[PDB]
Amino acid sequence: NSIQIGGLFPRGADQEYSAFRVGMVQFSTSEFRLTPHIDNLEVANSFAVTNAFCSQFSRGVYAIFGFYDKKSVNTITSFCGTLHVSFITPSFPTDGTHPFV
Amino acid sequence: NSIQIGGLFPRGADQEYSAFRVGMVQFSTSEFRLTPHIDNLEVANSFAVTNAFCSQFSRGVYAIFGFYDKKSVNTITSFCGTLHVSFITPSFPTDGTHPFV
Amino acid sequence: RWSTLEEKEYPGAHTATIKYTSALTYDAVQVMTEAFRNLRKQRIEISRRGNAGDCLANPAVPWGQGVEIERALKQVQVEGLSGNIKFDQNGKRINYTINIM
Ligand SMILES: *[C@@H]1O[C@H](CO)[C@@H](O)[C@H](O)[C@H]1NC(C)=O
């Protein structure tokens, strides 16, 4: 019943994380429940994003919810296209058709 | 006193790699040389650059010479900014001030 | 010497013109050789302690002698195919000359 998911949140994004916790309560059913793994990081540093994305991939997550900056967006899209990891994000749409986004 | 160096060259960059091999011959010394590990890779794929950059760091290079695209440019700059690895490139200048480039 | 090289060995090199991307590659090797040469001249060592390990090391461990390699590279001032070559504290070309034709 435990579904492991990855969570990447910027350090200056509090309300954006508060709404995530509310969604976990409002949509928590009795059949199963999601188990988020949060790692607060600097979204602009693409090394921190690369290091944090692989931290979720090693822990065997089934999906990742995060953000990206201009200095990282291509890091997320290319890693998710190769490892076929699904990535959900409320940031700006990708400049083109990128799968697993 | 051989000094090992990382070499990232794109697939179609044949003349650029030729001048690189010419540069070593014209500048090699009898006291020290250059030992490059050449990873021919697709420059646009950020995961390929990330996996290739770590392939050079695990090999213990003292500097890395390569290229980058509009997509993977922020991957190199941040990876070198945190690991203190020097990167040398003839690609377009970074839109801003990024160290170890 | 360029237009004399065998095209079977160095592809795209037996012509009398050289790309600006390819020429900067040749001039790049000169900067790398003069950097490590000045490190041997200024009497400091850059040899590694052991295996650099995994790039995704947590916490991110940056080697100390990497900042000495950055100082040597940006202080290189030689003459090459691109004219006068010298760098600032960031890594951008300065005192350079772009011919207008
Ligand atoms: C700047 O470049 C010019 C042209 O090569 C050169 O004459 C001059 O010496 C350089 N400046 C310094 C401080 O070396």
Curated annotation (Swiss-Prot), chains A, B:
Post-translational modifications reported in the UniProt record: Palmitoylated. Depalmitoylated upon L-glutamate stimulation.
Tissue: Detected in forebrain. Detected in dendrites of neuronal cells. Expressed in the pyramidal cell layers of CA1 and CA3 and in the granule cell layer of the dentate gyrus.
Source organism, top-level taxon: Eukaryota
Subcellular location: Cell membrane; Postsynaptic cell membrane; Postsynaptic density membrane
Induction: Down-regulated in the pyramidal cell layer of CA1 in the hippocampus by global ischemia.
Function, as annotated: Ionotropic glutamate receptor that functions as a ligand-gated cation channel, gated by L-glutamate and glutamatergic agonists such as alpha-amino-3-hydroxy-5-methyl-4-isoxazolepropionic acid (AMPA), quisqualic acid, and kainic acid. L-glutamate acts as an excitatory neurotransmitter at many synapses in the central nervous system and plays an important role in fast excitatory synaptic transmission.
Notes concerning its domains: The M4 transmembrane segment mediates tetramerization and is required for cell surface expression.
Family: Belongs to the glutamate-gated ion channel (TC 1.A.10.1) family. GRIA2 subfamily.
Subunit structure as annotated in this protein's UniProt entry: Homotetramer or heterotetramer of pore-forming glutamate receptor subunits. Tetramers may be formed by the dimerization of dimers. May interact with MPP4. Forms a ternary complex with GRIP1 and CSPG4. Interacts with ATAD1 in an ATP-dependent manner. ATAD1-catalyzed ATP hydrolysis disrupts binding to ATAD1 and to GRIP1 and leads to AMPAR complex disassembly. Interacts with GRIP2. Interacts with GRIP1. Interacts with NSF via its C-terminus. Interacts with CACNG2, PICK1 and GRIP2. Interacts with GRIA1 and SYNDIG1. Part of a complex containing GRIA2, NSF and NAPA and/or NAPB.
Extra information: The postsynaptic actions of L-glutamate are mediated by a variety of receptors that are named according to their selective agonists. This receptor binds AMPA (quisqualate) > L-glutamate > kainate.
Protein's UniProt name: Glutamate receptor 2
Organism: Rattus norvegicus
Gene: Gria2
Residues of the full protein shown: 25 to 125 of 883
